[PDB]
Amino acid sequence: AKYYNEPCHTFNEYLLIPGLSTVDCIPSNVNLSTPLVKFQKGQQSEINLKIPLVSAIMQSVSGEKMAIALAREGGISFIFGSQSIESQAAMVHAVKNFKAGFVVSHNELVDSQKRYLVGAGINTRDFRERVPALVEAGADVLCIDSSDGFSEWQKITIGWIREKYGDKVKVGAGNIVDGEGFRYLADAGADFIKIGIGGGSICITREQKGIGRGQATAVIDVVAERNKYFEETGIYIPVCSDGGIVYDYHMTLALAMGADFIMLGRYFARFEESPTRKVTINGSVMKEYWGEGSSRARNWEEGVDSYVPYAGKLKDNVEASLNKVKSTMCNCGALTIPQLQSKAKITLVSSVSI
Amino acid sequence: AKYYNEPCHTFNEYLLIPGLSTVDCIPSNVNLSTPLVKFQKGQQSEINLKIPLVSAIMQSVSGEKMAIALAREGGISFIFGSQSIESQAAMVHAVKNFKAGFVVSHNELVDSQKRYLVGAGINTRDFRERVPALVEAGADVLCIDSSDGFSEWQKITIGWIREKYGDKVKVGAGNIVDGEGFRYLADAGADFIKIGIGGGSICITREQKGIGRGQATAVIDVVAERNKYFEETGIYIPVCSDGGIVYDYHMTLALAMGADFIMLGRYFARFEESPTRKVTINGSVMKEYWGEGSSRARNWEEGVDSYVPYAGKLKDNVEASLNKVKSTMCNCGALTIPQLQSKAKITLVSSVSI
Amino acid sequence: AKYYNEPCHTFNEYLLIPGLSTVDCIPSNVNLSTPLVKFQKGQQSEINLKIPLVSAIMQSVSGEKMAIALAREGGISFIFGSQSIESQAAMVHAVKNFKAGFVVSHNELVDSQKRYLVGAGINTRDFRERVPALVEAGADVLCIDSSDGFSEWQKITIGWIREKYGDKVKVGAGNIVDGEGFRYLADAGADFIKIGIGGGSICITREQKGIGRGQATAVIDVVAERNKYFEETGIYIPVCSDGGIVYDYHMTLALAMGADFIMLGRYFARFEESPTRKVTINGSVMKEYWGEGSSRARNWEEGVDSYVPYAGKLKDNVEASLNKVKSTMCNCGALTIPQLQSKAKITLVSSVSI
Amino acid sequence: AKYYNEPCHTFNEYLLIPGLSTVDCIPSNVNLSTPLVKFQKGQQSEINLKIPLVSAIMQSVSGEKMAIALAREGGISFIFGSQSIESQAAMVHAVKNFKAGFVVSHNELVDSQKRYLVGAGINTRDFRERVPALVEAGADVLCIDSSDGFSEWQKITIGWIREKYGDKVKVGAGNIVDGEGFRYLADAGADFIKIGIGGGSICITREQKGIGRGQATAVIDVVAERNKYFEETGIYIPVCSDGGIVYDYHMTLALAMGADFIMLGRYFARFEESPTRKVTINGSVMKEYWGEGSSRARNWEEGVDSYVPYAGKLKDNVEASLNKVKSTMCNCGALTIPQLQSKAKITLVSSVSI
Numbered sequence A, B, C, D: 001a002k003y004y005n006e007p008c009h010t011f012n013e014y015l016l017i018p019g020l021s022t023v024d025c026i027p028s029n030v031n032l033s034t035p036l037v038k039f040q041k042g043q044q045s046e047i048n049l050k051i052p053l054v055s056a057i058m059q060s061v062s063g064e065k066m067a068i069a070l071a072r073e074g075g076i077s078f079i080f081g082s083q084s085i086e087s088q089a090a091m092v093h094a095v096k097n098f099k100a101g102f103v104v105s106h107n108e109l110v111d112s113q114k115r116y117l118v119g120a121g122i123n124t125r126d127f128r129e130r131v132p133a134l135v136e137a138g139a140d141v142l143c144i145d146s147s148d149g150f151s152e153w154q155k156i157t158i159g160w161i162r163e164k165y166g167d168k169v170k171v172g173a174g175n176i177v178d179g180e181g182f183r184y185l186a187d188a189g190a191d192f193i194k195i196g197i198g199g200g201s202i203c204i205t206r207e208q209k210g211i212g213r214g215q216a217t218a219v220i221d222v223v224a225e226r227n228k229y230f231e232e233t234g235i236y237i238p239v240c241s242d243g244g245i246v247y248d249y250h251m252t253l254a255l256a257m258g259a260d261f262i263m264l265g266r267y268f269a270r271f272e273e274s275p276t277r278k279v280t281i282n283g284s285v286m287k288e289y290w291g292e293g294s295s296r297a298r299n300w301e302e303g304v305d306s307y308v309p310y311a312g313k314l315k316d317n318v319e320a321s322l323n324k325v326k327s328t329m330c331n332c333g334a335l336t337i338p339q340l341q342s343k344a345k346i347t348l349v350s351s352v353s354i
């Protein structure tokens, strides 16, 4: 067996040490643009998010309304794939054609036709039928959804997409937690790679499957491999820190450690736009939230079902969260995510102080 | 005094990092066969379990019914030796002759005569009389039961067995927690060595005797010594991780760290087949469970007596546990235990994340 | 990104190991004098506190009465700047002219005219108007108050002061937590540098902003840079450990680690002289205490409002605290703060023992 | 300031790993004799305890009855010195002349006249008068009682004793927690050195004074210095682990780490023979226990007053404790304390497993 020198850590175990803040760095001047899909050295990504936040590929998070609301603020949602091909394609189509008027019976993220961008999750099983349907519906990007992306099944899925669509259809893959996993999916052709196993808030109320790694350590390790890969091939593959974001400052940390964007479930589940029921229990307005591994999810094993405090509209909450991220970025002397990734000073905190 | 560079750790402090999962690895194709007794390089063990689980040498765990139920699923039970020679021999005989019809007044683990295999615990005191009786009764393997197997008494016991039966009678020894202890029992002639002191769940409700070591560290250290021993002598001695299994994923970890099989007490005590009373307390069906060191056990000092939640039939529970182990093995890219031991990537987790 | 070899620690994680105590070291012979502003090798600071304690630049701590009471015991207060220029200048003037008799409508810290010394906090925004007013009022020293002093805004503020007053007006700067930050403010011209971000007791009831560092690690790191700076330039810049003092022995630790003086908020908020209301809740006399980042403070975001147990007069409490500090200093073989900083033996304690 | 590479640890953070147990090692054959005062290489100590336990120099622990009861079992008590010279001398005399019949108005520890041995605590202040009185009363050994023995006052006290009595009067000194402190008292002439600051159970209900060190680390460090000192001078100075013994196995650990004997307060306070009142609170028989630093103690600052569960007669409790120590010693392959100190394998345990 192979062992490691240091134990893995979570975001709660880190803090940022300030760098030189210039008179020109104020929250409003901070640019949160970030690449979504791979590109070559010197190029720009074909798809750039205006804010580094994407909603989780979950039934209780990314429905049509969430996708529209998030795209309006500059991010993108990945419509859940744990539903019928027809049902998921309908949501994608609804998002792509939302601005239409008569239909035959500032930071918005849109395509060349001013239509909101939207992503869609796929699986390694029915892709031969699901992918064409999502492509037809107008999906802007796809992502293989899995608890263990270090699999030949993902390579096969990406291969089929490349053979049928070449590099015209974008597809992310995951999840992985180390350089080996990243490298495998990179060579397989993934446009972006998702990082994270066992770090989601859903795991708080469930038992360990035995596989996983502290989210912070996973991002740091994968990012190092991604940078090495860039140096060897000239190909820059964006990576996504998926899960484990508990507080707003965790967002800044994930980005500082090298993640290009962040995927969140619980964070968005709390909003009015999530596709779940708003329930009031003893004066407390809550929203439903369950894992994709729960029996409640897959039936169209693991299992986690819970409630999250209602937070209102997505817009006001994201604005507040990102204002804090931008302010912290200025503390670190960064006006952009790439500058933050270059200048960030990250310290581990003692367990005693926690 | 001799000190160590790193502190010892328990199973809860580890997680497995996924490896490449091939299209051919599905739970049903995973082989959990494993050697029980020592053999030379290139040989196969004379006794191979079909599943890597054996029940503890305890009054509250391994009785006749447990032995039959576990053997039926591919494992083996070690009938407790903390009872009269006559009483223990009777249980062994009952297991060996269970399939008999008229008696004169798929994954089953059996001998050449299709009789379920069964083991029996012995002590370093009355072995001259207990061993012959167990051999006559048909015991397939014996194991010296002790909290500290690094003892001349164990060497003497194994020696007497070798002098009387040669290598025709198999006998495990233990418990030890480091290379020195392993080496001593290996040179003494033990067929398999049990690892673990102070890691049993029984210790949760009792005070430390002062001796012990984190179960994970103990297995890792002993396994390293065992592999070194194999390289020097060509003799492969199976080792058993005894105690400390709290969750199913701990089983996968123990195996990944090098243990050939696992001994459990609490896990099996919960089943209908354990020899203890099923008691209902306030709507909760429980089963009794007490340590062999408790005054309640030895009287035919330490002391631990408690209850464990009823889990029903052994069969359904083991199937569920092993299905999870096999699934995790596929995440790690392993179709067998030896392949897992070779490919496993094991990371320590921070105390903060725990 | 830049990472660190060791995690940061708080004061609770340290203890002092005794050194040789001489017959001449008794609490009463211990000298707690300490420099407040920078000086060259071989010189004495133009301003020396008689005790190493200064009260925080907070609305709920440093008002006129606090400033008089603390100066009487040998320390100095920094009148809060989160109020109108006119209001703050009035408090400064009131302190400077407290001993006056007819006014036209042993360890005391005083100026050449026997007037109590007093400091005043300033900000990087209205200094062009606030500074002249404070200077006119008689402020003896100023200090830029900020959660992140590693800023060009602080350099600009110090620059303006130097251009207008040369080295005749003393001004501290902060806060910083590492050598880089210290170095920046040192080169900018600061007379003393304050250390500490996120370590204040106020943070106990609030969420992390994402920036910070264990107070002990921050002091140790900054002190090392300060000593290096002294060796390179011959300039000795006093540093202040700001926040995180929970127990009296933390004072001794901060000083032993190299801090010349200590800034405290909660400690002084408990006294009769703090400018907040004394409220009795269920038989418990308390005093109000809120952070400068709370909405309650700035309105003339973050937010922390709470109560601290009443402790009575500042005099008796400081005497008791310092008697303990002096006794511990004698345990360490030190009769002065500089001797303590040279002889102190500081050990980290295990999280288990905590 | 001077810092250390590793944090200090307590006894709870350690466990012993078994060594080879020989057929000749059974509890009854284990010899717990141990030296009390210094001797040269090749010699035997002039005073050897029959068991390695001594009672604390406390008002609530070591009175006349305790001294007699402990001496009867082979240990020695140090009559508290926090009382009048006349009062303390009376207790010493009472112990020395307990076996007398008409008075003019197996493992027992005795002198050449069959009189129970007894020690007495002294202070660095009134020794010129207290020492002669204790010597006259028949005290067999003295010990300077202090929270910080790294003091010129202790050197002066030992010096006065040597000048007046030469090496005919034995006197221990302490407390210290590192090699420097040990070395100072060794060169000063101490017959034995006590280790421990802040590790006593009394500290559980009180605030840190700021000085101290984990008890285990303190013993290990001092023992290393003591062994180095022995190699350089040929003088063997016994050391005493004072305080921090919570469980019986802590005794074995302290001895294994190199301490020759152990001083305990709480342990003995629970017995019928302690000089405090036996009080029954709600069906629970308790005994009083307070620190020597409490105002309740010195008045003939710190302060700790509490209750300990009644345990009955000293005899039965010590026998049980030592039976466990001896059994563990056999697990480690040791028949004597020196053999244990040579063969012991000591591992640190993870904070997670604790």
Ligand SMILES: COc1c(C)c2c(c(O)c1C/C=C(\C)CCC(=O)O)C(=O)OC2
Pocket (backbone or CB within 6 Å): A145, A146, A147, A148, A175, A196, A197, A198, A199, A291, A292, A293, A298, A302
């Ligand atoms: C696929 O969605 C996830 C993801 C992305 C992760 C985890 C997880 O449990 C599930 C649900 C698990 C499901 C639906 C079972 C199928 C599978 O195994 O893919 C996790 O632990 O890390 C990441």
Ligand SMILES: COc1c(C)c2c(c(O)c1C/C=C(\C)CCC(=O)O)C(=O)OC2
Pocket (backbone or CB within 6 Å): B145, B146, B147, B148, B175, B196, B197, B198, B199, B291, B292, B293, B298, B302
């Ligand atoms: C023998 O069964 C065990 C085993 C295997 C272990 C422990 C233990 O306490 C007992 C009971 C202890 C008994 C019956 C006393 C006799 C003895 O000492 O063997 C333990 O701590 O690690 C392993």
Ligand SMILES: COc1c(C)c2c(c(O)c1C/C=C(\C)CCC(=O)O)C(=O)OC2
Pocket (backbone or CB within 6 Å): C145, C146, C147, C148, C175, C196, C197, C198, C199, C291, C292, C293, C298, C302
């Ligand atoms: C300025 O007073 C402080 C200081 C000294 C510190 C912190 C802090 O939050 C505030 C209040 C924050 C305010 C008033 C907002 C403006 C600003 O950012 O300066 C902290 O975390 O470390 C040190």
Ligand SMILES: COc1c(C)c2c(c(O)c1C/C=C(\C)CCC(=O)O)C(=O)OC2
Pocket (backbone or CB within 6 Å): D145, D146, D147, D148, D175, D196, D197, D198, D199, D291, D292, D293, D298, D302
């Ligand atoms: C002297 O008895 C002790 C000892 C041995 C220790 C401590 C302690 O507090 C006291 C009481 C402290 C007193 C009576 C005040 C005088 C003094 O300082 O000696 C401790 O922390 O480690 C060891």
Ligand SMILES: O=c1[nH]cnc2c1ncn2[C@@H]1O[C@H](COP(=O)(O)O)[C@@H](O)[C@H]1O
Pocket (backbone or CB within 6 Å): A056, A057, A058, A196, A198, A199, A200, A201, A202, A203, A242, A243, A244, A245, A263, A264, A265, A266, A267, A290, A291, A292, A293, A294, A302, A303, A304
């Ligand atoms: O059932 C589940 N168990 C564990 N993780 C899950 C499950 N369902 C989704 N996830 C992961 O958890 C992420 C959300 O983490 P969260 O933002 O902390 O709530 C998702 O994007 C997935 O990667």
Ligand SMILES: O=c1[nH]cnc2c1ncn2[C@@H]1O[C@H](COP(=O)(O)O)[C@@H](O)[C@H]1O
Pocket (backbone or CB within 6 Å): B056, B057, B058, B196, B198, B199, B200, B201, B202, B203, B242, B243, B244, B245, B263, B264, B265, B266, B267, B290, B291, B292, B293, B294, B302, B303, B304
């Ligand atoms: O009384 C006891 N004290 C400590 N360990 C015990 C005792 N009795 C049995 N054991 C050990 O605990 C193991 C069971 O651990 P468990 O599976 O965690 O319950 C047994 O196989 C023994 O090795």
Ligand SMILES: O=c1[nH]cnc2c1ncn2[C@@H]1O[C@H](COP(=O)(O)O)[C@@H](O)[C@H]1O
Pocket (backbone or CB within 6 Å): C056, C057, C058, C196, C198, C199, C200, C201, C202, C203, C242, C243, C244, C245, C263, C264, C265, C266, C267, C290, C291, C292, C293, C294, C302, C303, C304
């Ligand atoms: O609102 C706030 N949030 C965090 N820190 C604050 C705030 N206001 C003041 N502080 C810091 O906390 C210090 C006081 O720490 P305290 O002595 O532990 O209460 C001040 O001197 C500031 O440096």
Ligand SMILES: O=c1[nH]cnc2c1ncn2[C@@H]1O[C@H](COP(=O)(O)O)[C@@H](O)[C@H]1O
Pocket (backbone or CB within 6 Å): D056, D057, D058, D196, D198, D199, D200, D201, D202, D203, D242, D243, D244, D245, D263, D264, D265, D266, D267, D290, D291, D292, D293, D294, D302, D303, D304
């Ligand atoms: O007031 C006190 N404070 C701290 N330690 C004390 C005090 N009085 C005695 N001690 C120490 O505590 C030891 C007893 O530790 P205990 O056996 O854990 O109760 C004594 O022998 C002293 O060294």
Ligand SMILES: [K+]
Pocket (backbone or CB within 6 Å): A018, A019, A020, A021, A330, A331, A332, A333, C148, C149, C150, C151
């Ligand atoms: K900054």
Ligand SMILES: [K+]
Pocket (backbone or CB within 6 Å): A148, A149, A150, A151, B018, B019, B020, B021, B330, B331, B332, B333
């Ligand atoms: K895999």
Ligand SMILES: [K+]
Pocket (backbone or CB within 6 Å): C018, C019, C020, C021, C330, C331, C332, C333, D148, D149, D150, D151
């Ligand atoms: K000292």
Ligand SMILES: [K+]
Pocket (backbone or CB within 6 Å): B148, B149, B150, B151, D018, D019, D020, D021, D330, D331, D332, D333
């Ligand atoms: K042994």
